[PDB]
Amino acid sequence: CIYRKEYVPMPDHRPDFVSRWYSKSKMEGLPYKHLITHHQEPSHRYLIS
Amino acid sequence: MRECISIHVGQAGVQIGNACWELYCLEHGIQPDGQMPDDSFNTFFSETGAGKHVPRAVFVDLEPTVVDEVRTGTYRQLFHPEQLITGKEDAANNYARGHYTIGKEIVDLVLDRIRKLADLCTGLQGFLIFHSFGGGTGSGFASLLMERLSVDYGKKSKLEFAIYPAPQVSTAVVEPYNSILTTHTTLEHSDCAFMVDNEAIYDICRRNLDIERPTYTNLNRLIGQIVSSITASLRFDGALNVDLTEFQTNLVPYPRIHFPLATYAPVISAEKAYHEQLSVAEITNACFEPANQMVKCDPRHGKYMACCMLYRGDVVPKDVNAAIATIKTKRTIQFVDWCPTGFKVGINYQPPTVVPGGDLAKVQRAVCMLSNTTAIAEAWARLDHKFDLMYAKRAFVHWYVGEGMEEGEFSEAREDLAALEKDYEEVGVDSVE
Amino acid sequence: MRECISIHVGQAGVQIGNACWELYCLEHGIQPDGQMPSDDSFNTFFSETGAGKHVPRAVFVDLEPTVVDEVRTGTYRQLFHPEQLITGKEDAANNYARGHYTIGKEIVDLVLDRIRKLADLCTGLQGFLIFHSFGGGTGSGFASLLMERLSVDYGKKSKLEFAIYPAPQVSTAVVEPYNSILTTHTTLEHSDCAFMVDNEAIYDICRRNLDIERPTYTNLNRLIGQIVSSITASLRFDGALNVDLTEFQTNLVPYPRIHFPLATYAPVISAEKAYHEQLSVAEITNACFEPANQMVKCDPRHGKYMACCMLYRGDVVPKDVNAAIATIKTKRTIQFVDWCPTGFKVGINYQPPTVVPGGDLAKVQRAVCMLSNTTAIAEAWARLDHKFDLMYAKRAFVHWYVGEGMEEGEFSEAREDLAALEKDYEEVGVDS
Amino acid sequence: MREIVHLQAGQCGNQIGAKFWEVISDEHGIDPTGTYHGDSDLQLERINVYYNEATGGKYVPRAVLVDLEPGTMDSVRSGPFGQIFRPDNFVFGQSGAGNNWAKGHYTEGAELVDSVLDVVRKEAESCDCLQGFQLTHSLGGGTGSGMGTLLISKIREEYPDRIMNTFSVVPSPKVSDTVVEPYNATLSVHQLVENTDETYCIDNEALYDICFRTLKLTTPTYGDLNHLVSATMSGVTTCLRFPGQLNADLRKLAVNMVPFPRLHFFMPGFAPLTSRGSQQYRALTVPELTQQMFDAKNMMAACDPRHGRYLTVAAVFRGRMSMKEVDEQMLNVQNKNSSYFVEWIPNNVKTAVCDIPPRGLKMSATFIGNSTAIQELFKRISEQFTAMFRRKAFLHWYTGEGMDEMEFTEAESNMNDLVSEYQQYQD
Amino acid sequence: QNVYGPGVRMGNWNEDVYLEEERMRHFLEKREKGELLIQRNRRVKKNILRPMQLSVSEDGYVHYGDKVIIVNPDQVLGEEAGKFMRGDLSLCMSPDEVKAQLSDDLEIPCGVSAVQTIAPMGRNTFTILSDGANSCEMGQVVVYGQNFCLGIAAGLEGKMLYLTSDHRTLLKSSLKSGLQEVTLTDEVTHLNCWQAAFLDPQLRLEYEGFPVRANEKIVIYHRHTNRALAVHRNLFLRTYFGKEMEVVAHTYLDSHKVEKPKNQWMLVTGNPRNKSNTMLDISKPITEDTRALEQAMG
Amino acid sequence: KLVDEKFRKSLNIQVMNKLERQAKNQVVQNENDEK
Numbered sequence A: 001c002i003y004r005k006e007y008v009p010m011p012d013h014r015p016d017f018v019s020r021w022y023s024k025s026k027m028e029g030l031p032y033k034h035l036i037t038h039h040q041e042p043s044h045r046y047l048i049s
Numbered sequence B: 001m002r003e004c005i006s007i008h009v010g011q012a013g014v015q016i017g018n019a020c021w022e023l024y025c026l027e028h029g030i031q032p033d034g035q036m037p038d039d040s041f042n043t044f045f046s047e048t049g050a051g052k053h054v055p056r057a058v059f060v061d062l063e064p065t066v067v068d069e070v071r072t073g074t075y076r077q078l079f080h081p082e083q084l085i086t087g088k089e090d091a092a093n094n095y096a097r098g099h100y101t102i103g104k105e106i107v108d109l110v111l112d113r114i115r116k117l118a119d120l121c122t123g124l125q126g127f128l129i130f131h132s133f134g135g136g137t138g139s140g141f142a143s144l145l146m147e148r149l150s151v152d153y154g155k156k157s158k159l160e161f162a163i164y165p166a167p168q169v170s171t172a173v174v175e176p177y178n179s180i181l182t183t184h185t186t187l188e189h190s191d192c193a194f195m196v197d198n199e200a201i202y203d204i205c206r207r208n209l210d211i212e213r214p215t216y217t218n219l220n221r222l223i224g225q226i227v228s229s230i231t232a233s234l235r236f237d238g239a240l241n242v243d244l245t246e247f248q249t250n251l252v253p254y255p256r257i258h259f260p261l262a263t264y265a266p267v268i269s270a271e272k273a274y275h276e277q278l279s280v281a282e283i284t285n286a287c288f289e290p291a292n293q294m295v296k297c298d299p300r301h302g303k304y305m306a307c308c309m310l311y312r313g314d315v316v317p318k319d320v321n322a323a324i325a326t327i328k329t330k331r332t333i334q335f336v337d338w339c340p341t342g343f344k345v346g347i348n349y350q351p352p353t354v355v356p357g358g359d360l361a362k363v364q365r366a367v368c369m370l371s372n373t374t375a376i377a378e379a380w381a382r383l384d385h386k387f388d389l390m391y392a393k394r395a396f397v398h399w400y401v402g403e404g405m406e407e408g409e410f411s412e413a414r415e416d417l418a419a420l421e422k423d424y425e426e427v428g429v430d431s432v433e
Numbered sequence C: 001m002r003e004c005i006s007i008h009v010g011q012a013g014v015q016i017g018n019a020c021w022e023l024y025c026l027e028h029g030i031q032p033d034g035q036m037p038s039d040d041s042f043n044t045f046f047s048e049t050g051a052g053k054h055v056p057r058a059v060f061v062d063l064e065p066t067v068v069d070e071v072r073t074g075t076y077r078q079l080f081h082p083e084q085l086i087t088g089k090e091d092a093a094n095n096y097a098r099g100h101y102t103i104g105k106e107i108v109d110l111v112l113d114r115i116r117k118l119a120d121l122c123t124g125l126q127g128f129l130i131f132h133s134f135g136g137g138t139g140s141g142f143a144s145l146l147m148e149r150l151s152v153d154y155g156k157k158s159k160l161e162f163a164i165y166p167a168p169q170v171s172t173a174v175v176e177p178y179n180s181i182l183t184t185h186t187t188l189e190h191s192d193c194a195f196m197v198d199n200e201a202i203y204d205i206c207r208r209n210l211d212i213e214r215p216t217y218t219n220l221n222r223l224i225g226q227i228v229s230s231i232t233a234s235l236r237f238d239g240a241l242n243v244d245l246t247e248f249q250t251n252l253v254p255y256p257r258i259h260f261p262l263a264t265y266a267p268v269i270s271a272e273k274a275y276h277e278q279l280s281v282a283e284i285t286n287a288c289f290e291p292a293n294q295m296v297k298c299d300p301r302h303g304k305y306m307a308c309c310m311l312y313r314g315d316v317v318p319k320d321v322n323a324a325i326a327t328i329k330t331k332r333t334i335q336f337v338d339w340c341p342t343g344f345k346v347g348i349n350y351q352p353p354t355v356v357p358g359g360d361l362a363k364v365q366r367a368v369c370m371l372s373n374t375t376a377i378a379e380a381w382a383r384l385d386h387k388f389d390l391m392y393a394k395r396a397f398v399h400w401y402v403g404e405g406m407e408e409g410e411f412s413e414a415r416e417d418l419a420a421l422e423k424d425y426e427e428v429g430v431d432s
Numbered sequence D: 001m002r003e004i005v006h007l008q009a010g011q012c013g014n015q016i017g018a019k020f021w022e023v024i025s026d027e028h029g030i031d032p033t034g035t036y037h038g039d040s041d042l043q044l045e046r047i048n049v050y051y052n053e054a055t056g057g058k059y060v061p062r063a064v065l066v067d068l069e070p071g072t073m074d075s076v077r078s079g080p081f082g083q084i085f086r087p088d089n090f091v092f093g094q095s096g097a098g099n100n101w102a103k104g105h106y107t108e109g110a111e112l113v114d115s116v117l118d119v120v121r122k123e124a125e126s127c128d129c130l131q132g133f134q135l136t137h138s139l140g141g142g143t144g145s146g147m148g149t150l151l152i153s154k155i156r157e158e159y160p161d162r163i164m165n166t167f168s169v170v171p172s173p174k175v176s177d178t179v180v181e182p183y184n185a186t187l188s189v190h191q192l193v194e195n196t197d198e199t200y201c202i203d204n205e206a207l208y209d210i211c212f213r214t215l216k217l218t219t220p221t222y223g224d225l226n227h228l229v230s231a232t233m234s235g236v237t238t239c240l241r242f243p244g245q246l247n248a249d250l251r252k253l254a255v256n257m258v259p260f261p262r263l264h265f266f267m268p269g270f271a272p273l274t275s276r277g278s279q280q281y282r283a284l285t286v287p288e289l290t291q292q293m294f295d296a297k298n299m300m301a302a303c304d305p306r307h308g309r310y311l312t313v314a315a316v317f318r319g320r321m322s323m324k325e326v327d328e329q330m331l332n333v334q335n336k337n338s339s340y341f342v343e344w345i346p347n348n349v350k351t352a353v354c355d356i357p358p359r360g361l362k363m364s365a366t367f368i369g370n371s372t373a374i375q376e377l378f379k380r381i382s383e384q385f386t387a388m389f390r391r392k393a394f395l396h397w398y399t400g401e402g403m404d405e406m407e408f409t410e411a412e413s414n415m416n417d418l419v420s421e422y423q424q425y426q427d
Numbered sequence E: 001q002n003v004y005g006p007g008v009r010m011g012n013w014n015e016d017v018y019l020e021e022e023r024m025r026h027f028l029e030k031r032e033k034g035e036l037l038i039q040r041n042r043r044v045k046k047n048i049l050r051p052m053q054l055s056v057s058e059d060g061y062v063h064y065g066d067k068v069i070i071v072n073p074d075q076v077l078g079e080e081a082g083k084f085m086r087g088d089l090s091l092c093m094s095p096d097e098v099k100a101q102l103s104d105d106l107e108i109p110c111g112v113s114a115v116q117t118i119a120p121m122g123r124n125t126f127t128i129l130s131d132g133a134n135s136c137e138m139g140q141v142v143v144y145g146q147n148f149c150l151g152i153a154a155g156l157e158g159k160m161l162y163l164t165s166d167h168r169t170l171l172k173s174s175l176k177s178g179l180q181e182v183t184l185t186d187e188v189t190h191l192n193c194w195q196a197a198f199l200d201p202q203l204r205l206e207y208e209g210f211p212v213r214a215n216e217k218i219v220i221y222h223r224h225t226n227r228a229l230a231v232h233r234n235l236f237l238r239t240y241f242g243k244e245m246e247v248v249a250h251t252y253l254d255s256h257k258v259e260k261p262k263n264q265w266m267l268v269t270g271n272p273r274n275k276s277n278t279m280l281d282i283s284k285p286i287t288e289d290t291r292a293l294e295q296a297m298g
Numbered sequence F: 001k002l003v004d005e006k007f008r009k010s011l012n013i014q015v016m017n018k019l020e021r022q023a024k025n026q027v028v029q030n031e032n033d034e035k
């Protein structure tokens, strides 16, 4: 029947959910600590007037 | 919320509808009974109280058989039986039948159904109409419905996905007559077109996909991939989402020239793609090689006027920018003088989900091009050629005359497309002295 | 407490009495024996005995026994008390005159005695429900007699009236314009509302909406019961906006001679059509305004509405009722007379309508009912006048009626009383 | 005291603003919930400048987030800092502009500005002494290029006195993602010049340079590109918020920066930028910072300053330092590159100091420059606009919104009358 | 043109290897300290899903102090339309996981939901305590019309979260339904009290002031509001644990003025034989049927 | 006279148009919230 044979129901396939997650985080990119933090200074390292 | 409505007409309309809506259901995870076991879920499948969903399409035809196939098919229980519309007698490759006598009995019913479907929707974005110029129903009935739809909704966007007759092969003799006759409606009542010929897909499948004996179903899956990748920006979340309004804006510079060419990459099977590394430059130049056009015309015989460029998947703006730069540093790709900037970049993240049992392999990154270029004009020139050499002895005119439309309107449409090709040449003219 | 008594008349009345009273048993939970199962909304229709069985407050009447005897042998034989179902040995046989002057008075006293007993049981009686047909002789003649004599026993009491108007094309009789014209006088001076419906309109609705290509009278009987349930539903069950029978009379009848509204029910869709459709309250009011879904063969796009009663029911939110009625007002082919700037009345009920087995409507969360009074119903009377004068010109069938003992002058007067009624319906159509 | 209302329009502005409201959220020691978790008193002495007091020790933005297309605002609400922006500060339409300036500025821009004008007016009277207004958008889109500039035309009528700073995103020619960009750019630059105190010309090409060569990042996405604009964001107002040896604010630089009101197009920069490899063997000192400003490479504008003369130049240093080296270096760079400054203004360099360095860093600087070479960008928009206006191409998308053609003519007239008087000052 | 993987030592490989070392070191420090999201979530969810053993109803009655479980049965809901989850539902404490990842502190107030699971565990186990104001000693028999409270310990040792609800205002309501909402709070007030009522409206006064049996259908009525504990089998809530139901306090009635099946409630006691199991999963005796042949004889 | 009567009704449509828009905006806000 052509049409029936082609559009058989065929379960077992479930759509992906996490490739979008990977691409979101790739577009996010590296955080502040790996962007500009120098000499691994902590929060209170330079806060004096 | 954003919503599309699909207006499929004819045997071609209903079969591309089968393939496209199947891909939509399989991507979103909809079971064939209409149930579920990060966006959209309202543009295409509106949801009822019991968790069921109902597609936003109408399939119309003047013969029952192909729609009765769906009514008995796999997804018989998914589509609302009101939406699928049929008639006893078809148009039989005649625009006159499809437009003047048998179209009227049903056009009110079709418009009532689409008015209801609009009242379901809250914010309607636009209409996508799928048909062929060569079919009597898909030509005449679609022309009437577009004519009445434009005056029912003045502002709503109307896109065309049409099967243009191929330059050499076709399945009808009076097909140039029907193609000629549909153009006045598709000129004065449309916004954008995607005329695609079947021969180009035949060659591209025999070339890249290694299927020497394809099917119309294999054609249909690729066209479904085209439309899904186009609507994917509304269907999902993205860095650079594009709307139908956006790419109408960068596909129509002038209101009478709304005829792009569609192209897709990468088109490749599992064994073939097991080796060749797929990247942004490769797909972006494969989309530029004239062997990949879905329209039988050579862009090297024209100049690009505008390019709408939709990426999808693990794409990065850096490599899109680099790919655009590499394709811009090229002389073989020409541009009209008045377009210094030429590209729309849209980006979506969902990697293309494969229909199992089809032909395409599982691909992580994909690209579609909608190129407004002037090289489509020679196709209409050849259509004009065959129309003249069949109109000269008044061949096949008696069918139309006896149905009841006047003969001189044929010459009217001939003059219309003569003027249209004249505008295309005028646009191709450049003011460099 | 509120109580309603049904005065169903005729084979139309009796066969309606089967379908409507089947629904009343299933919604309140009554077994066909009458006793509720072992595991007081019902009081307006049923009535407690000592035995704790609920006897219906209805009086089936007919002038032939065959229609009623099927009830005496049917499934609900043990629900209806024997004295309530009134029969006769001979019928009017498609004749207003037989059922009004020579056969009617034989059983006038017996039913008028029985109705008093059912009225005795009720302390506060809400009203009288009368179901008949303009076609049949008993449905026209006898139904005209008791309405005249009901008026002299209870002057204040409302007499709601549901009938079967002759259909404009299909016909199960020939002399029925005489029955249709002559009865309307009593419906003019001795009725407080109307609910006229045509079987042909319902034939259109069932095939178009319920996909049943071959209906029967029951399919037409079931929908009528759904109408009578919804109007009374605000009495039986609690709601946000309860509306009584006296309430909706006020907001639907601007003039004493104008008491002919039109009924409409929505949604009426099969399970496969309730399969793939979301049912919002907006989706079921726009359906109640289209002429194709109406129940009389008349188009209010040819007339002007003068009053509308909205009867909502189910999981409805009063917020979205206001949204729906607002959109209807933003439409030019829905008109109103210049003296009705506000032409709505809304009642709200909590309990969704039940579903009977063997029916056609699927179980639905929400529903709408409508009683719309328009002047486009006047055109229905015009065709009846047009047909009546084609046949009174040659004095066809006249010898039957005189031989049954009525004077020919009423043929003139009953023709004329409608002529004034049609003219009265054109004065309302004029805008000052 | 001196409070800033931060405007935010377009997809770009919505994102860099969420990026901007991440740094000043990080530094001021406020957690993503809304509570302060910093250590020192100085971090909460002036937080009225960006944050609004709310019950429970929780602070809320003075930020207005506008976008015609509701698609992007779900992403801002779903970031790491998506539990900080007030929902009533979100105002959105249902339909986008489709990259048309005319639509966002005339047709659908009318119905939304009443909403945006309302909430800024609510935040206008909320604080006592506003310092000014500050906006981010893109001139290459349809909303920020469009309805973003419509607010500028409106708020300047309401509050003439307050300074207005715009960190706008100027399209690049070598990398273009829109063909109606030279239309919307021509129709927004015209709107900028009369109503704006100081414009920070930001682009995307030069930012793609900086990560590739100065930071050696192999996959620099839009997020890292948004990092650097947010860095320059805080450096402009790093003196208003904190003490120092020589304090400043928005007005002190602006009066020191604008000799004639038509010249307010700037050229921003950020100093401590080196690779992830060089996190140890690189000294964080005053002179190497100054050596990093005055290259053409660190620059995030799309022009080479060596083709023009710097009119005025401001350096805002962050962190604690001895002062004498700066005046030695700023004077030194003035003497050696004497040919690259205009003679008719002496002592061209402006210096201001806050004492507090930013978070995770010991010393920082921000350089804002008015130079001749910003003219090189404006001539070449017209190099594209003329090519598209002469054929009347793509025009009917605009004339369908009720505007005329003369607006196109007068927009080119005003930019032409900008560069012509800009060129005289170089010569 | 030939972009390579991690270890191929190519092109921009040096800087990427530096950056890999940086991220790896940061993750190592957090792993050693114990601040990883995986670690934190694992510990807190273990402390949630810890199993226990219930009390045994010796006399077929419930007492103060007995560990129990609240379960609504699966009555034959032929009336229910749309989508309704079947099975026996159990009232269990539901937290907000987003706030769990934001802050490690306990979440006051903490929601209550229904999950189709009758296994006793840390999420759904309620101790029946006294009224506080009234001296109902431990081991005393629970009575109809007598106030009692239920409590669940969670998170830090010694927590005594009590379920409460209050008269509805505009500023507090159920998340989706909009009716009166019920939640868990640590404080002790008079709003904490709950009463039990017999099923049939007719003999409720007759059975007033009588001992309450276990694993039997009853109605729950909050004292101050007079409303009832009800579950919306149609409204759903997706959480980390899965698909959980919506629970509110609003009395529901039929056309015959009797509580609809969403107001039915069953206490749960432990199986005397197997401790992990409850009474509702006790086995049934295996015998054969004689009614068929018996009626055949007649 | 008749011209004035048409404008007497085209002022009314805007009221219910505003009501419809307001309800749709609220539904849009809730559908954004859950997402």
Ligand SMILES: Nc1nc2c(ncn2[C@@H]2O[C@H](COP(=O)(O)OP(=O)(O)OP(=O)(O)O)[C@@H](O)[C@H]2O)c(=O)[nH]1
Pocket: B009, B010, B011, B012, B013, B015, B016, B061, B062, B063, B090, B091, B092, B093, B094, B098, B132, B134, B135, B136, B137, B138, B139, B163, B170, B171, B172, B198, B216, B219, B220
């Ligand atoms: N690509 C593609 N083309 C199709 C498909 N089905 C039909 N066509 C084209 O449609 C042309 C004929 O038009 P039809 O759709 O068959 O006929 P119609 O539109 O119903 O009009 P009538 O012939 O009068 O009934 C053929 O030449 C095909 O090229 C399809 O599934 N895929």
Ligand SMILES: Nc1nc2c(ncn2[C@@H]2O[C@H](COP(=O)(O)OP(=O)(O)OP(=O)(O)O)[C@@H](O)[C@H]2O)c(=O)[nH]1
Pocket: C009, C010, C011, C012, C013, C015, C016, C062, C063, C064, C091, C092, C093, C094, C095, C133, C135, C136, C137, C138, C139, C140, C164, C172, C173, C199, C217, C218, C220, C221
């Ligand atoms: N819609 C509907 N019409 C009915 C039904 N039963 C009878 N009728 C109508 O009744 C008309 C004939 O009159 P009947 O009711 O059968 O008889 P009658 O009213 O007792 O009067 P007589 O025939 O003189 O005895 C027909 O035209 C039918 O349209 C019914 O169940 N549903």
Ligand SMILES: Nc1nc2c(ncn2[C@@H]2O[C@H](COP(=O)(O)OP(=O)(O)O)[C@@H](O)[C@H]2O)c(=O)[nH]1
Pocket: D009, D010, D011, D012, D015, D016, D097, D099, D138, D140, D141, D142, D143, D144, D145, D146, D169, D177, D178, D203, D204, D222, D223, D225, D226
């Ligand atoms: N600098 C920067 N530019 C961006 C970002 N996101 C988008 N863009 C740019 O914004 C332009 C499109 O802006 P658009 O969204 O149409 O502006 P709108 O129409 O006003 O909303 C594109 O050319 C992008 O390059 C971002 O995060 N940072």
Ligand SMILES: [Mg+2]
Pocket: B010, B011, B063, B090, B092, B135, B136, B137
């Ligand atoms: Mg065909």
Ligand SMILES: [Mg+2]
Pocket: C010, C011, C091, C093, C136, C137, C138
């Ligand atoms: Mg009869």
